[PDB]
Structure formats: structure tokens, C-alpha cells
């Protein structure tokens with residue numbers, strides 16, 4: 001009932017925004033990118049009281065679940081996804097580590113990374129893909145909760 | 156060729172969900188209830204290129220069409236329908252304003268407001284009644300498009 005989650009991705013994709021929206025239920029219009037802190041919150045996932053220990057990157061090997069986050073209006077971030085994917089494989093020494101691909105900023109119309117690209121990437125990793133928006137709370141809880149559901153399976 | 160539409164109803168009925176599903180063609184599992192923003196999208200209604208200016212309540216007097224939205228699994232929302240109905244009559248100072256009654260969340264089985272009650276209410280207002288689901292896109296376009304068709308006959 002206690003989970004250690006880790007949010008990874010390129011700078012400016014909304015790693016901090018997604019975390020704060022989950023923890024403090026509000027949207028941050030700006031957040032210091034050099035800040036890397038762990039956050040804590042007792043929540044209810046699928047009716048079960050769970051403790052979430054989330055690390056907003058800017059221990060790693062103590063992570064049970066990982067959020068691969070990019071922005072749908074940021075091609076470069078999507079390109080950097082594989083870099084972080086492989087880091088997690090090495091730090092965990094495993095092929096099968098609970099992960100979720102996250103497409104943030106789905107509220108923005110200036111989309112450059114279409115659905116097929118993201119879903120093909122997730123298909124190449126065999127992990128779920130969720131479109132999120134930290135501004136509007138869209139898919140935010142689902143992203144973290146799905147990861148926890150992935151951990152439940154592995155454990 | 157341009158239309159100003161206003162979506163009203165009780166909190167949590169899916170006003171935001173119905174708007175996003177129309178504009179960005181996706182479903183929001185959660186949306187900040189305190190967010191009231193105007194949205195814009197050029198669409199094709201019955202073959203005719205139209206610009207839709209939609210206000211998602213949480214400007215009013217400039218509304219040409221109004222969506223009266225409740226949830227079929229929300230008796231209270233249905234009860235509050237007349238409240239918003241009369242507000243629009245006052246803000247427009249008119250006895251005849253293009254409106255459409257919308258029963259959202261039709262994808263849910265836990266129904267408490269049957270078709271009889273809704274249709275009887277729509278008949279009491281002399282306006283169309285549309286069953287919608289922002290989750291599955293059911294009746295979403297038809298709801299907004301019908302309202303536009305109501306504006307057409309009105310002018």
C-alpha cells in the first residue's frame with residue numbers, strides 16, 4: 001500500500017506540474033526547473049488507501065514505478081524518451097519495470113506529436129500511454145494510478 | 156456564419172467535457188470545475204463552414220444559443236435546469252431564445268432520470284432534447300449542431 005514513483009522526462013514537459021496537480025490539486029503556471037524534490041501524499045486508488053512517494057526529477061534505484069513524460073507540443077521531448085527509458089532499465093537491472101508513457105499538455109492546440117507516434121512508441125515498450133493536462137487535471141490521476149496498477153501486477 | 160454558444164448547467168454535469176470533446180475530440184476524465192473559459196473552432200455544420208464561439212460556464216448576454224445540460228445519473232442537476240432556463244430568459248430579456256436540453260453521461264447504467272421526465276421538460280420549454288455522452292462522443296456534435304440549426308430558423 002506504499003509506492004515509490006519516479007517522474008522522468010526532458011526539461012519543461014510538466015514533470016513538476018503533473019506532480020503538484022496530483023499532490024496539491026492546483027496548476028503551476030511556472031515552476032523552478034532546477035528543483036528536484038520528493039513529494040508525499042496518502043491517496044485512494046481504486047478504493048484502496050495508498051501512500052504515494054513521488055520523486056520529481058530535475059533514490060532512483062528504489063523506484064517501483066516510472067512515468068515517462070513528454071509534451072505533445074514538444075517533439076524534442078518525445079525524441080528524448082528512449083534515453084530515459086534505457087536509464088531506468090540500467091538503474092533497475094531489468095527488462096520488465098512498471099512504466100507509463102505520458103503525453104502532457106493535451107490542452108494545447110499546437111500539436112506536433114500525433115497519437116499514432118506516441119502509441120507506436122508505447123507499443124514498442126509494451127507500456128500504457130496516457131494523454132494528460134496538468135492545467136486542466138485531465139488524465140493526471142489516471143497516469144499515476146495506472147502506474148500503481150502496473151506495480152500491483154509486477155508485485 | 157459565426158455563432159456564439161453558451162453551455163450552462165449544474166456543477167459536474169459535463170459542461171467542460173462536452174466542450175472539449177467537440178473542440179479537441181477527446182474525453183476528459185477530470186476537469187477543473189472552477190475553470191470558465193471561452194473556446195473557438197471552425198467546424199462544418201451540415202456542409203456549411205461555421206465558426207463556433209463557445210463559453211463554458213463554471214459574454215452571457217451576447218449568447219445566440221444555449222445548451223441546458225444535466226446528467227442522467229444526477230437528479231439534482233435535472234432539478235436545477237429550470238433555474239438556468241429562467242436566467243437565460245432574463246439575460247436575453249426574451250421569451251423565445253434558441254435552447255437545447257442535454258442529458259449527458261448516457262453511457263452510465265445507473266440512470267435516475269428516465270427519458271419520460273426529460274422529454275416532458277423539453278416539451279414544457281418547446282426545445283429539442285438530446286441524449287449525449289462526452290466519453291463516447293455520442294450525440295455531442297448533434298447537440299451543438301442542433302442548437303446552431305435552432306439559431307438558423309430564428310434568423
Ligand SMILES: Nc1nc2c(ncn2[C@@H]2O[C@H](COP(=O)(O)OP(=O)(O)O)[C@@H](O)[C@H]2O)c(=O)[nH]1
Nearest residue numbers: 011012013014015016017029030105133134135
Ligand atoms: N498548457 C499546459 N501547460 C503546462 C502543462 N503542464 C505544464 N505546463 C507548463 O509548462 C511549464 C514547465 O512545466 P514544468 O512542470 O516546470 O516542466 P518540468 O521541467 O518537467 O518540471 C510550466 O510553466 C507550466 O505552466 C499542461 O498540461 N498544459
Ligand SMILES: Nc1nc2c(ncn2[C@@H]2O[C@H](COP(=O)(O)OP(=O)(O)O)[C@@H](O)[C@H]2O)c(=O)[nH]1
Nearest residue numbers: 166167168169170171172184185260288289290
Ligand atoms: N461516464 C461519463 N462521464 C462523464 C461524461 N461527461 C463528463 N463525465 C465526467 O464527469 C466529471 C465532471 O465533468 P465536468 O465536465 O468537469 O462537469 P462540469 O462541472 O459541467 O464542467 C468528469 O470527471 C468527467 O470524467 C459522460 O458523458 N460520461
Ligand SMILES: [Mg+2]
Nearest residue numbers: 016031032033
Ligand atoms: Mg520541474
Ligand SMILES: [Mg+2]
Nearest residue numbers: 075112113114
Ligand atoms: Mg510530424
Ligand SMILES: [Mg+2]
Nearest residue numbers: 171186187188
Ligand atoms: Mg467545468
Ligand SMILES: [Mg+2]
Nearest residue numbers: 230267268269
Ligand atoms: Mg424517479
